[model samples]
Target: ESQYQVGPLLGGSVYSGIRVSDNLPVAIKHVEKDRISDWGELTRVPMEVVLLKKVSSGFSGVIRLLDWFERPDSFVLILERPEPVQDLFDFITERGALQEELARSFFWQVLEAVRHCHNCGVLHRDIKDENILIDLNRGELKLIDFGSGALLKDTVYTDFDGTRVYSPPEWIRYHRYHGRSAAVWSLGILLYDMVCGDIPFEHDEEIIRGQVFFRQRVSSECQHLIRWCLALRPSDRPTFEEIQNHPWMQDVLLPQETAEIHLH
Candidate 1:
């Protein structure tokens, strides 16, 4: 049997495999020795496992967790393989920008996923293109990768981890990570990228850092949402509940029944 295969099922930090007898696939996440020892904890924490279970309970669109195993060297999560489709990154690459209608549909689904996680008091510290999975046949969206996921009961996280491009300005400036607001900023950046085919932060480090603190700009529809997301102060940003009821989102989202009916 093959030890690992790196094609469609492979994701950021994990490579997946299918069970030979049943053809069911599993995601293998290797926790480096340095990380576990440095953190002085189990490779996979109980809280992380709890969060995973909570996400699984709430979102049917998420990949199914079959089993979890821990070895001295790593942790393995057995999961049901999602039917392959273009990753959000590749999808954008092929079609410079998505049609507004299609983007609206994707936006609604992503919001629902995030809403569910928020209700459970979990914070997906990392939200970006690579973490979102799409099912082309049904146009379904699934949020993956909970490696950085954390419970947000206390309302403050000092540890900073996430991709810079999608991260909010405040995160870089203050070196603090708030829960939902930070996530919102990342979502706003993602939406802008989807529509504009360019990330707001340019390639130059000095310019990007400057914009992160000062001169960020975006289109009107996006600007409104992003402004709340990237607000210099975390409390200034909209909550998930507020965002759900926002007029812009209400105007853009597809009808729930219509979206559900169209699933393949």
Candidate 2:
């Protein structure tokens, strides 16, 4: 009765599958219709679908959406499931912490994707290791899970659905934060997690203090970059362009061959 046959559940509302037509691997997600708060302006598609469709066009750092289907009670999104890929958290768990060079390369790709999202007027509010997948074959990063995202705006956001630990001090203390600053703060936490083997803060009080402890022997330049991003004052955080041009980023060689997995 259908062209797709569901395989084992991946977790929560997602499942693993293959397209019968071409044997293409896919991740299927089922979202209850009522759970959706926003729909596409021109179509019945969910905002996540629209956001992903927009941001993924010019960047390979984000996971690709292949198709979607609307049901009477739920909606299904078919996402490209890259083989030999694992979430960054799981990858880090297996390998412990990443070396400075490897972390720098992945961070560069993450910046590219986040910049693309901002350019497209989309905000991926949740930027954490769990939401990032590493394609082991090509050593590329793919940002996933737009469920916590919102449209970009210059105004301060009062409500946040992102993980609290990764949130900025401004968001913790004042219950409000601007887009770019909060994004930079999260990137700091992510960078710290990647190289230090753990998040900087464990509680709300610790997060508000914005004090990061580097248990690992990280380079001073790298630590400096992390400190800039995690500044307690949001105004002190670096912009996307500034972050890319930071001294720690210089001379870090990205992969010579930009081999993207053709998921379409």
Candidate 3:
């Protein structure tokens, strides 16, 4: 185990994957001194274990947590790796666009997963392409990463976290963060990316200015949903349940039998 070298995973965070044993691969997350301020004293190991447990027990699309351990310098999380599919964002980028039907199928799965999280009182503050895993064989999707998750009942957060590209205007305006609306905004950006193959906002320009003031170009369907999600007021955004049942989503998703997997 000590002979194996670990490597960085997806995001800019300090998480890496190491082969612990021949059959066991573990993700080790190190909270840098700067990142620790965001999570306070909570160790990423236990918090992630709690969140993963809840998701595995209650949700259909979630990566299963196998085990975890703590170290003075880092927290190790053992996870079951799901089948690799093209990252949704990269898939769209390559295809240039997605068929409405396929887009709907993916969206429905995501909504269902989000609904499950909300029902369990956990908020997935960061919902983005890098965190969502796709299983090509089953056409299944799974949500990963819980370093930023918080229980809704604990207390609402006013601090900003998550990728700015997918973040909602309300979060930017109030500097307040809540799970439901923020996730909805991410969903909208994801939908737009599906059709447009790029984020609506440019990095160099302020997203609010580009999206609201300058009227950047986007597909009509993408624009309508984006406007709804990017509303300056949180109440203006649709609820998770509403999003799951939206007509556009309903029109695109095909009925399929749910598959059983090792959730936890």
Candidate 4:
């Protein structure tokens, strides 16, 4: 334990850190003992850790979990920290808005990561600019923060733990929502934010109306995909398979370009 130097705060709660052995960069998150949830048969661990472990294998779009520690008063999560990267929110703040091609690349990567999560029976429950990291040089991205995650199921979720802007209309209207549709809705919001430089709906009334407006000019195909994903009626949204075959997603010359440079 003494071989590590815990540095300054990354986001007030999470701390920046380094492994002294190799001087590797890592993110350390501390969770109070009271917050740990009971997992399989008498095992206790943070639900975030469990969700990350479930999808960490064979997936580079999601952030990698390195190691964890069980302290007397809390649990410490050791997570991989990609260098020369910026959160999507801050990236957008500086870049204004992304061009369609670049945004398409990032969009494709997030879809792959979300698909893997569902296939592994996990739901990130939170997909936003602040939760995604973009590599400055490689143009790759990684999904981070599984703190609001939950196990996937064909059931209605009554509670919401993610950002309000990202939450689907059904969750806000009925206080219940299905996993797949809600995920699709959030993806639409993300895509809109990336290309348009701001979320489509800021107020609850606008979200309920599901009327999206663009401040900057964007491609029609991209606009269609976002609208399809953000359908007010959950049943109208595209399935993961349908989303993959959509024109915008299929337009990539090198799908693996965004999927390249594995994060170790």
Better of 3 and 4 by lDDT: 4
Tens digits of per-residue lDDT for model 3 on 131-248?
7776655667777777677765645577655677777765666677667777887887777666555666755345555364213344455456556766656678888777756656
Error of 3 at 20 (Å): 8.5
- CA lDDT of each prediction against the hidden true structure: 0.63, 0.84, 0.62, 0.84
Give the clashing pairs for model 2.
none
Count backbone clashes in candidate 4.
0
TM-score of each: 0.77, 0.92, 0.76, 0.91
The lowest-lDDT stretch of 10 consecutive residues in candidate 1 is: 207-216
**Residue runs of model 3 more than 4 Å from their true location after superposition:** 1-34, 38-46, 203-206, 209-223, 251-264
Query: How displaced is residue 79 in candidate 2, in Å?
Result: 1.0
Candidate 2 runs further than 4 Å off: 38-40, 43-45, 256-264
Winner on lDDT between 1 and 2 is: 2
| C-alpha RMSD of each candidate structure in angstroms | 4.7, 3.4, 5.4, 3.1
lDDT of 4 by residue, 191-261 (tens): 99999999999889998999988898999989999999999999999998898899887766354454353
Compute the lDDT for candidate 2: 0.84
Worst 10 residues of 3 by lDDT: 255-264
